[PDB]
Every structure is written in structure tokens, then in C-alpha cells.
């Protein structure tokens, strides 16, 4: 890798600089290099990794949806719309494969604490979900089941090892509920998960400090936003 010659600490410092400069492709490349040093990541470092790739793949997803919509409408202008949608789609799949590769080599297998293991398994579910969004082949069902399996393992650990207000647990439930709603075609499961997650967090808020309260209620509001659109 092109980051092989840079110090781990320098890569993390530059990832933070890149974030400030809104240079998310750089940020992702720096964090990939930091992961490939082979040491486990701290909480802050995990979040730098996730923020970086979330921004990169987010730009690709938005572009893919624009092109897919133009393509659907067009279905004569020639092969160009399909070709360019395919180009963006292939780049998106490449980013997802890169993230999944980092998780599989070897972030997940070395993650023993709930906070790290749930975080990485949630990411694995997320990037299989982004692959599922563009999947149309004979692999779509297996991609969907890979997302489900990762989310489910993360859910099982989070329910056993974290309080219901834990922001990682909450964000996992949020994303798994969206997976149910529009990837798995299970809107009822999505609504049930979102409701139970919200209600169990509400009952646990009394245990929290003012700062933790703020962190938890922020994600609870996202659950409520979805419930409002779904019901």
C-alpha cells in the first residue's frame, strides 16, 4: 500500500486534517493505511475510519441514484447512460469491497470488546447493505443475507453486553430497521424494531449523565423520524 511508509500516528493525524478539509477520499486512504499497520483501533480511530468511508460511499450512492433514475426514465439515447451508471456502480462496489476487506483482514477477528466488535459488525452489515442497494444479479439474495447475518450477530452481542441507550447499539438498531424496511421488504419488522428500540432506550435515559443523554436522544430522534414516515 502507498501508505506503507508513513507512521501510524502520522496517518491518523492526517486523517483528522483531511476531515477538517472535507477531503474524505484522502481521509479514507489514510485510515486504510492506519488499519493496515495491523494494530487494533481505538474508539476515536474506529469512528475516523467509519466517517471517512461513509462520506466516500455516500457521494457514490447519491450519484448512483441520480443515474439509475435517468436510466429508468430512458427505458433511444444509446448505451451511455447504462455505461456511466455501471462505471459509478463498479466504483461504489470497489469501496464496499475495500471496507469489507479491512473488516475481514483482520479488524473483526481481533475485536473482543462489545464496543469494538458491535461497531465492526454493524459496519459489515452497512456495506453489504450498500452492495444490496445496487444488486440485481443472482448474488442479490446472498448479499442481502450477508448483511442480515452481520447485523444479527451485532444485535445479539449488543443486547447482551450494552445498555439499551448505548449509542452504538442504537445506531445499529436504526440501520438494521432500515435494512428490514427497504432491503428485506419487511416493513413490519422494521417498525417493530424501531419502536422497541426507542421505548427501551426511553426507559433507560434516567441512568445517564447530561452528555450521555444528549448522545442517546440524538439517535432516538432518528428512530422517531423513520417511525413517523413509516406509520
Amino acid at each position: 500500500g502507498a501508505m506503507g511508509s508513513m507512521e501510524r500516528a502520522s496517518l491518523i493525524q492526517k486523517a483528522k486534517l483531511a476531515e477538517q478539509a472535507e477531503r474524505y477520499e484522502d481521509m479514507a486512504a489514510f485510515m486504510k493505511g492506519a488499519v493496515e499497520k495491523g494494530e487494533e483501533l481505538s474508539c476515536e480511530e474506529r469512528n475516523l475510519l467509519s466517517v471517512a468511508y461513509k462520506n466516500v460511499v455516500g457521494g457514490q450512492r447519491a450519484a448512483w441514484r441520480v443515474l439509475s433514475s435517468i436510466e429508468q426514465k430512458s427505458n433511444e439515447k444509446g448505451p451511455e447512460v447504462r455505461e456511466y451508471r455501471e462505471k459509478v456502480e463498479t466504483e461504489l462496489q470497489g469501496v464496499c469491497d475495500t471496507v469489507l476487506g479491512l473488516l475481514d483482514s483482520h479488524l473483526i477477528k481481533e475485536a473482543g470488546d462489545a464496543e469494538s466488535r458491535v461497531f465492526y459488525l454493524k459496519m459489515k452489515g452497512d456495506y453489504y447493505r450498500y452492495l444490496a442497494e445496487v444488486a440485481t444479479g443472482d448474488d442479490k439474495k446472498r448479499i442481502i443475507d450477508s448483511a442480515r447475518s452481520a447485523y444479527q450477530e451485532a444485535m445479539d452481542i449488543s443486547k447482551k453486553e450494552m445498555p439499551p441507550t448505548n449509542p452504538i447499539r442504537l445506531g445499529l438498531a436504526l440501520n438494521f430497521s432500515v435494512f428490514h424496511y427497504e432491503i428485506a421488504n419487511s416493513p413490519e419488522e422494521a417498525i417493530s424494531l424501531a419502536k422497541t428500540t426507542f421505548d427501551e432506550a426511553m426507559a433507560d435515559l434516567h441512568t445517564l449523565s447530561e452528555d450521555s443523554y444528549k448522545d442517546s436522544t440524538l439517535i432516538m430522534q432518528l428512530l422517531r423520524d423513520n417511525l413517523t414516515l413509516w406509520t
Binding site: N55, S69, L174, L222, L229
Partner: peptide, 12 residues
């Protein structure tokens, strides 16, 4: 497409 809320940066 109507996009629902998910965790982290709303980057798309």
C-alpha cells in the same frame, strides 16, 4: 429516492 434515516454522516 426517499432515503430513510441511518447512522452517521448524511453524505448521500
Amino acid at each position: 429516492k426517499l432515503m430513510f434515516k441511518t447512522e452517521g454522516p448524511d453524505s448521500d
